[PDB]
Paper text:
The [name] ([name]) plays key role in immune cell function and is a highly valued target for treating allergic and inflammatory diseases. In this work, we resolve the cryo-EM structures of [name]/Gi complexes bound with the endogenous ligand histamine, and synthetic agonists clobenpropit, VUF6884, and clozapine. The overall structures of the [name]/Gi complexes closely resemble the conventional GPCR/G-protein complex, where the receptor/G-protein interaction primarily occurs through the Gα subunit of Gi. In the cryo-EM structures, the G-protein engagement is mainly mediated by the insertion of αH5 into the intracellular cavity of [name].
The natural ligand, histamine, is well resolved in the ligand binding pocket of [name], surrounded by D943.32, Y953.33, C983.36, Q3477.42, Y3196.51, F3447.39, and W3487.43. Histamine establishes direct polar interaction with D943.32, Y953.33, and F3447.39. When bound to the receptor, histamine can act as a dication molecule where both the imidazole ring and the amine of the tails are charged. The positively charged imidazole ring is positioned such that next to an interaction with D943.32, it also forms a cation-π interaction with F3447.39. We have additionally observed a small density adjacent to E1825.46, which is insufficient to accommodate a histamine molecule. However, based on its abundance in cells, we assigned this density as a phosphate ion, effectively linking the positively charged primary amine of histamine to E1825.46 through hydrogen-bond interaction. Collectively, these findings suggest that the phosphate anion plays a crucial role in stabilizing histamine binding. In binding to H1R, the imidazole ring is orientated to TM5 and TM3, forming direct polar interactions with N1985.46 and T1123.37; in contrast, for [name] binding, the imidazole ring takes a completely opposite direction and is orientated to TM7 to interact with F3447.39. In [3H]JNJ7777120-histamine competition binding experiments, F344A7.39 shows a dramatic decrease of histamine binding, consistent with the structural observation of a direct interaction between the imidazole ring with F3447.39. A comparison of the antagonist PF03654746-bound inactive H3R13 with the histamine-bound active [name] shows that the most notable change is the outward movement of TM6 on the intracellular side in the active [name], which allows the αH5 of Gαi to engage the intracellular cavity of the receptor, the most common feature of GPCR activation.
Residue numbers in the entry:
A (entry chain D): 10 to 61
B (entry chain R): 14 to 203, 293 to 372
C (entry chain E): 2 to 120, 138 to 248
D (entry chain C): 4 to 340
E (entry chain B): 3 to 53, 182 to 234, 240 to 353
Write the structure that this text describes.
Amino acid sequence: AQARKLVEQLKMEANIDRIKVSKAAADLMAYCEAHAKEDPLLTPVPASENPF
Amino acid sequence: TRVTLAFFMSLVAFAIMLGNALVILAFVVDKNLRHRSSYFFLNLAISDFFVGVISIPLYIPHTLFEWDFGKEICVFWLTTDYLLCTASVYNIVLISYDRYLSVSNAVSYRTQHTGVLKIVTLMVAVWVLAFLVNGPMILVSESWKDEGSECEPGFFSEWYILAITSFLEFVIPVILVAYFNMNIYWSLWKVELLRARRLAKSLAILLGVFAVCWAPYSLFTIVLSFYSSATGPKSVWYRIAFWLQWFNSFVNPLLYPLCHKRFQKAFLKI
Amino acid sequence: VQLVESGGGLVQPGGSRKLSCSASGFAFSSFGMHWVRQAPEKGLEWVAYISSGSGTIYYADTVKGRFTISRDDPKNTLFLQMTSLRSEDTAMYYCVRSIYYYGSSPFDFWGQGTTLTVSDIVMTQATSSVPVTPGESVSISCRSSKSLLHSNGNTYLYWFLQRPGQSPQLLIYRMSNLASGVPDRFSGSGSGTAFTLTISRLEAEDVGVYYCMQHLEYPLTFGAGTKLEL
Amino acid sequence: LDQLRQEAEQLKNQIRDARKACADATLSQITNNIDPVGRIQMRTRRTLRGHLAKIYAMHWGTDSRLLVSASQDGKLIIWDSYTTNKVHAIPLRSSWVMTCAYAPSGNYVACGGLDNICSIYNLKTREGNVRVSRELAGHTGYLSCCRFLDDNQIVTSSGDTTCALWDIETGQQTTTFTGHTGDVMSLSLAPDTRLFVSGACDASAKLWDVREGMCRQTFTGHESDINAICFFPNGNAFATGSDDATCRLFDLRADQELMTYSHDNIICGITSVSFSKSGRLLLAGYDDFNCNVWDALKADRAGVLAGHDNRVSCLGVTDDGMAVATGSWDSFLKIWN
Amino acid sequence: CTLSAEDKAAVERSKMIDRNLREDGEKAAREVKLLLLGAGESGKSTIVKQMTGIVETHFTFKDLHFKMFDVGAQRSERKKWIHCFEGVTAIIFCVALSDYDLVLMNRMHESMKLFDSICNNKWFTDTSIILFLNKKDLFEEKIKKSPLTICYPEYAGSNTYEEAAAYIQCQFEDLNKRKDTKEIYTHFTCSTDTKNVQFVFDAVTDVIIKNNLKDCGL
Ligand SMILES: NCCc1c[nH]cn1
């Protein structure tokens, strides 16, 4: 029973379409560059409007 | 000649002031020390800090250059000095009693709740009794009969007023501290060798320092003020016996408060 | 949730009178309590305030030192005591709850009031009567004498309603919010020192008297009231 | 039996070969042309006191003003971070708490621990108090983390190799996830609210789909147990920490490992991990009695936010990204920006 | 002040909550916490009677409040859960005597390994242990027919109960490796009167006295 369950689980997890690593790296760096002006802990907010 | 003496007196005054200012700051900064021990330590620190503010510096002109002070300053000086010294001694005794109750009964010491007003009641009764010990008689000192002298009490003429004062300020505290420390040791005695040796050494130090730093001046005063009233020349023995008394306020902030682990942690926090 | 008052009656000039309020169905030890007054044919009037912890007690600028406010927490009872009554205190009284923390809605539940008979930023209501027809949109505006936008960013105007033969219920708190149990067809907005409430798609049981209050700083001032009738 | 084992080994080898063939270029060779953040320093703006014992969890609200904290005294506290006030104090029945949650609608909170029961509390009522709305039971070990999926669905993970999804109104489980071998310690919901990933005491993590119940995928690679998992803003990455002084960055599509955060002077444990609002700063809580800030794309920087006298055991970030809250065993809670 | 009335009400609320929290916390640091531990079927049920998840038992003895925590229902790894007990006053350990021959690798060696793992743990370098040896009647009535060499080949003593008990007790106490910091107390589990609580009361009194003295650098 355990062997059959393991075989079924591995068969389910084996048939998966994949993409290259470079694509994921590009997507991550793109999202990182896309919000460079809205992060209050990379570019500090002027003290006139900062609640803290 | 005068320069070295002035430098040494200034050094002693600054040492006392810093040594007690550290403890006052340590209590002020930390808010987790709301227990009995910290209250008593703060009382000791306040007394010992005021010891070195009014007494030593003003005394320096009284015995170095020129007495431009008069009666109105002399009486104030005497009252302040006596009150502060007696307060410090009584604080030592109170800390000893607290520690003894910490071991003579642990169950009833862990399950009490009095932490509001009895503490301040005792802290103020200490100073009240400290005044009452010496204030009246020193305020009824007018029998110099000679305009122009040093600033010393008026009861150094009769020996039956010096003796009682030295008896109700010195002997009883020593007896009580010895009795409490002996109870603590004998109770905790019942691996063993090192602990017994260490604790015997610690208690022996904590009693010997007090006894040695407060006995000689009282002895010299009583012996010189019973029969041979030498009111003129004073040798080095008298002048070192006077100075030994104040040197206790340097040692006290090093033995009682600093040895505690909580206060070491608080100091490390600053 | 149920507050009931008692104590009203008829009194000769002078004398004394004590009024009580009994609560049932909530935590009486987390709410501050106000007493508010209404004249026989006029607008409401602020009277007194008592807070949680019995620390703060205010009073009216008119009868200070003559009224006594007290609370009893374990028995959940609120007391007012007055002596030497003149003819200016023939009116009805209301008990109001309030709780102040981040996000709350003060003046939420009112009582049923009691009757007594004896033998400062300025709020003025603009109008006295507006005839309307169901299915029409209505705007009711009132005015002030100083700015109400506090520095931290709030706004402290209150819009209350009163139908015939009933007690008031909060329509809008802090000049822009909506209370509990109220239909979602109301709005309110204003430009500093002058404010207006908007009602869309009128219906029955929506005719009566509307009131607007301030709470920027004590004391609090009332208006005459706008009567909306069909 | 032998044929099944041989088939499993062949499938594992095929998966490994496919993963190796799918690895062509690494991001460590791409960020060398990226300007670093530079030195980053922060200062204590507020300090919240009132807790006595240690602090085990904290969680931000949905508006970046209200705060929840859980201690070993059996106490839950709801604060305001703009004026250092207390809005609520909630007592508990079991003093052994290890997780908390804040409902996105600002109405409910949750607690759990070693009693095997998850308690759900309601904040807004007509009597002015806070009452116990629900008690969920059905696990056999101990709860490690609970999150609100919606206002009427909750998710729990325990130390019995089991994760579960509960429907609050009914009181009964609707789906169970099994397949782990040891204790489970973390889970982090996705923004689209359809998937979640969980890490075990067995140097592995698994990604799950909620509606169906089938385990979606499994990642391995750590030398020892996994103790904290957070989840990237876009929903296509996550990062984990182990009790080996090591952090790792995994992706759900490339099916491989991307970056390793480690340094020779660090030989203590990792207790919590969180990201920032743009995916450019990674905040980690170590056992060296201090936190650390890592450049998420270059994997080299050590901007210690020291200031605690014991182990830092939880941290969090606001939704608008304008504060960082840290809680440690020293019984204090601090706010940074 | 530069605040509205509502903010003053808010700070009053906060101060009141602070007072309540402080009172509760101070009332919650005036009690004794004990952690129970023993081997499988070690008779600790008898200890609980004579005196899922975590099971908490309460009692009050001579003006002290004792909280006993039993942790037998847990089956996960002990490394990721043992740290939450750093502040306990004492660990109670229970071990069986009449299980020297039964093999589950008898019971005695497994108990020895468990004790050696617990006593030298890093979180428990200043926490005292109270050791119970139980099931002694069957032990006395079992050595009349079975020799102790069945599990202790090195033993070369008399076939009497007292020698056996002394040998077992010394063998257990020899496991300690922190003789200068924490002590170990031993007692044979009685079954006729209320000594099993008096022993714990004495042990905790001694622990309190020593902690008090050693916190003062004395
Ligand atoms: N006789 C005052 C106490 C004293 C003596 N010497 C110094 N101080």
